Every structure is written in C-alpha cells, then in structure tokens.
Design a protein around this ligand. Sequence first.
Ligand SMILES: N[C@@H](C[C@@H](C/C=C/c1ccc(/N=N/c2ccccc2)cc1)C(=O)O)C(=O)O
Ligand SMILES: [Cl-]
Lengths: 256, 256
Amino acid sequence: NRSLIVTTILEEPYVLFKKSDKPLYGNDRFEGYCIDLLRELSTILGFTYEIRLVEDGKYGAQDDVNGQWNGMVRELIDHKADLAVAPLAITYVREKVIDFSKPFMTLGISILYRKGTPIDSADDLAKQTKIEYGAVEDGATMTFFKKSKISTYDKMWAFMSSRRQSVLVKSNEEGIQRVLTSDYAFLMESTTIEFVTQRNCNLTQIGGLIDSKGYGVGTPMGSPYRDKITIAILQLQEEGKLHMMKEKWWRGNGCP
Amino acid sequence: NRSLIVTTILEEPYVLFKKSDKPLYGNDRFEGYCIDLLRELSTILGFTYEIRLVEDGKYGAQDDVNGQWNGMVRELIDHKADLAVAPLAITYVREKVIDFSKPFMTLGISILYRKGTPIDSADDLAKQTKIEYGAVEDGATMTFFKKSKISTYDKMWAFMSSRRQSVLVKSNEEGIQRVLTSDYAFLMESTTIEFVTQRNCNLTQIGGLIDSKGYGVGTPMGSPYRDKITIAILQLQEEGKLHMMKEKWWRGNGCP
Ligand SMILES: N[C@@H](C[C@@H](C/C=C/c1ccc(/N=N/c2ccccc2)cc1)C(=O)O)C(=O)O
Ligand SMILES: [Cl-]
C-alpha cells in the first residue's frame, strides 16, 4: 500500500476539472473516465495516490535533435511519477522507453469534419489542397503521418509538413475550434471524435479508423505495477466495468 | 542461438496445413495468419523456431477441482514451449499464470444474422421470442452471457439456458448453417463472424461488439521474449502489416 504519484493531462472526457462554485481540494478537483479508472485500479491494487497534472502539459514525444523525451513519458522515465493514467497511445517508440499496461480502450486515428459535404475519406482530403487539414503538433496522431510510408498518408504529411505553422494546432480545444470556424478537417483519435460528435451536432467522423491502437497506463520501465495493472484492467473489462465507465462518460448530451 | 519451440493449434484461417503441389518440409507445411505473424516476428527478433501442434487440442483452461491447466497455456507454464502463437484470448485467469504480448488483434462477441431485417442489436433479439438465437455450448461466448449483469444479456442467457436443447449447438459450423436455413441468430467472436460474412454474402454482423478482448502471443511467466514480441507487434501494426495480413486471410471472393 504505497502512496503513488499519478501523472495525467486535461482532456475531456478522460480528465477535466469538476464544475464547482468554490475551490475543490487535491484529487477532488478532477473528474472523468480516467479518474474513475484510476479509482477502480486503486481499489483493486490497494494504493492511495496524488494526481499531478503533467508539468510541461504534453503527452510525450522525442526531440529528434537531442533524443530527449518530454511530457508524461519523460516524467515516468525520470521516476517523477509512478503511473500515467490518461488517453496516452501505446506506440512502438514509447513502449521502447516505458512499460505500458495492456490497453484499457482501443481506438484509431480518424477525421473530424462538417456533416453534409462530399468528403468521405483520407483519400478525398489527400487529393486536393482546397480544404485544409492537420493534427495536434507532437501527438501520436501527428507522429503517425510523419513516419508513414503508406501512400496517402505520406502525401497528407507533405501537405502538413510544409504548412507546420498554419494547419498544425496546439491542442484539441484548438483543432475543434478550427473545424467549427473555418474550412478544416481535424485528424484526431476516434474515441475523442465520438465524444465531440455527441456535443457539436453539426460535426461528424469522416471515414473509418485509419489505424488501430490502444490507450494504456504508463509506468516506468521495470515497474512492478505494470503487470498488476494489466491484470486489474482485465478484471474490470471482464466485469463489464470498463464498458459502464465508457457509457457514463460518452453519453452525449442528446445529439439529434 | 537456440531455436524456439512454438506451440499452436489448428484453427482456420490462423493455422492450417497448406495445400500445394510442391514438396513442403517442416514448418513450411503450415500456413495462415498466425504462421505469417510468426515468420514476421522471427525476422524482426532474429530467432529460428519449430512449430508443434498442442497435444490435447486445447487453448488452455484451468480445472475447477485441482487447479491444473491444459492446452497451450499448460505447455508455457511447464516451459515446454517458448511461445504460443495462436488466437489465444488475453483473459484475466490466463494472464495471471503466463505472460501475454500486447494484442495482435482486438475483437469482441457479436451477432451473425441474415441481411435485410429490422434487427439491429442484442436488445432487439432479447425482447422477442420469434427469432431464436444461440451460441456454442460451454464456449467463451456462453460464459459471457451467464456472468453478465447487464439487463439485456441477462434476458438472453435466461432464454438460451432454458431453451438450450433448441438453441445451443456443439460447433460454430452447426450454428452458421442454422442462420442460413432458419430464423436464427448466432453469437460468436467477431473475427469468426467476419470470416463467415466475407464468404456468405447473404449474412451480416448485427450491432457492434458486445465485449472487448484481444488475441496475444503467450509466453511463460518471466519470459525475456514477451516485451520484445510486444514491441515487434506494435511495429507491425504501425506499418500496416497486421492489417494487410488480416485482409489476406479474411477476404473472400467479394460481395456486392
Ligand atoms: N493521445 C495522443 C495525443 C493526441 C492529441 C493531442 C496532443 C496534444 C499534445 C500536446 C498538448 N499540449 N498541450 C499543452 C498545453 C499547455 C502547455 C503545453 C502543452 C495537447 C495535446 C493525438 O491525437 O495525437 C497521444 O497519446 O500522443
Ligand atoms: Cl503487456
């Protein structure tokens, strides 16, 4: 029964500040899917924890000049947190430097856009330059296009790469706003798209999932929590609890 | 330098004997998704191997009286195999006794039924009695329904259980043939449903995934290969190689 430090990041509906008229204290300031998941994990494993929002505000990417990591990944590497419980994508490059639990949610990159247009796939966007499109700078989604040898997606990356300053945004809050107020398609993880489209009733996911990945709890390399967390996740999945938590948090405010 | 012993089991289209007019020897006698996966893994990690078909023809379950395991899971526990490369579901009870890689495929229980009807979900079946529905008796799909506390799945279990002589079958093939000839829906893994619907143009999956689980490569607890194989699988996913393999082994002769 250690007391752990858990790093996480603000992103609805995984983690948000709980609405209140007066200051809330400590872990009580937060709510969301990942907050509920962290509570269920602590019940099973028997630990208390302090939630600390990641200090530099980032998920985790590697500086290609100096090799250094940032974000929640770096916090784990440096043993500044015990666990990262967030919508943090399990990717090849990250799994090499930290230990992820098995996934608690499965998803893929897709496209956020306006409802009734001729666009129907990544190919449709890749073909033309008239409708702009991008992703959040330095997330797994942007990293995917940058590294992809796949035809359409190297082509999409050229468009993005040569327009880094315009089409790449700094957050999801900013991407969504750009979709809503300009002619722009936002490349984004499908779970987040599904939350957005149950709120902004004039937006939609375009096409299928472009790839496949999961979110996992991050731990430092070698951590004894990693396997215990994987086993607790499997228990919660088999009890129906992960599904119930997803329904709780994605229950859109009634989108006609 | 030591070759690995890989336990597996015959299961279409994951592992089958290859039909060929040309002489085949040893491992080359097998083909399938899991064989292609093993070959990619051995190229990436640089190991040689011998494929062996599991002695008791089982994936792996624990005896409810004496606590002993069988199947491929037992071969890993006893250190008789280094890897199990098969569509072995990553479950809580198994993950406690062996080390699974991360999933190479993610799936769930779903519903096989004919096209063209107003039936659109599990709930549509649950609240009627005209259309019969069932599953393989004593299979993982049945286990789910029996333990679920969800209202819809509870009704479904009560129906299937009480009507077991009428609606449960001994094999997927008996259930599929029944969907084709009679007013009957069949519950099984979505991977199997996809294989079927690619070959039976008059059939479809109804609704989405009822639960969520992954197939993973098994290794003995503590194996140094587990994390390596995880990292190779993530590389293959990101390169689009696992998607290409899935398409190769699942695609049928096309349907309008
Ligand atoms: N979930 C993905 C990240 C996800 C999208 C969002 C990435 C993102 C990256 C950095 C980020 N940073 N926000 C701040 C905010 C304030 C200060 C510094 C940074 C905000 C969002 C994606 O679709 O790629 C991952 O795990 O990398
Ligand atoms: Cl793992």
